[PDB]
Amino acid sequence: DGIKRIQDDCPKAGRHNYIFVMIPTLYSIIFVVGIFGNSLVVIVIYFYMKLKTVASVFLLNLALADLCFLLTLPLWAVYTAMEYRWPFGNYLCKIASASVSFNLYASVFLLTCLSIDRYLAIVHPMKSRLRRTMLVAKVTCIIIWLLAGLASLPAIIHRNVFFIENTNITVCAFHYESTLPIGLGLTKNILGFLFPFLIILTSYTLIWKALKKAYDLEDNRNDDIFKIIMAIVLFFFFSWIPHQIFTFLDVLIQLGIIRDCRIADIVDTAMPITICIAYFNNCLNPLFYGFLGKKFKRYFLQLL
């Protein structure tokens, strides 16, 4: 409803000419690539493949979650290009920030469920065949969308458009006064990374050791898949650990130890870079996981 007037502690942090050009360009590239990529992914998995497996359902919802983020990307693009000026009002500020947060939690939760499905599908195929149906997949997906929204609720609540009195700039942001905003950062750290990375590593490690123990008896294909699995974990790890690290470094400035504007400048300079890395490699996630299937790769290639 209203516009609040705010004073900025370290205002000219991350306000550099080269970022104002570099970040909207990368955003444009991710937008163009992600839209047509995940759109063709959805075309292949549902209308072309008919969603006949549980992993198919998770793959569908993964691409559909990424598309929602890509649609709000252009707002951030022109927001960064205008030297951080927000001309879209409070409403779109709310939904765009909630959509970025929602894509975070949704995609990570979906990877978690994909890992459990893979483990149960290879280690315990026959006994988990009956319990792993389509209804449980769709129910799991609605629970994940609900919980991801539930996790991004403080984004809808605490994201506003503020008038920075000391710079005369209208921005879309969080305002930190103490005031316990560190919850919004820990929830990104522990609830958005620590717990799902642990679960994902666990599932793929159980698959790793099962298949190794299987091939030992023969040695006393499946030799490729190990390197593949090592990608999957590390690719998930190294594409989110930059952002997460600087996110943690941001909490120290939100209400604690760091009380400097030069450090704030480095953090605000690097945060969009880490965001770019994270979300570029995230918007490639459905396509990277899909090409791991021979039939999906055949269909997607033929579509080009």
Partner: peptide, 8 residues
């Protein structure tokens, strides 16, 4: 205070 203008 601190103004976190970044998307996430």
């Amino acid at each position: 205070g601190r103004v976190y203008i970044h998307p996430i």
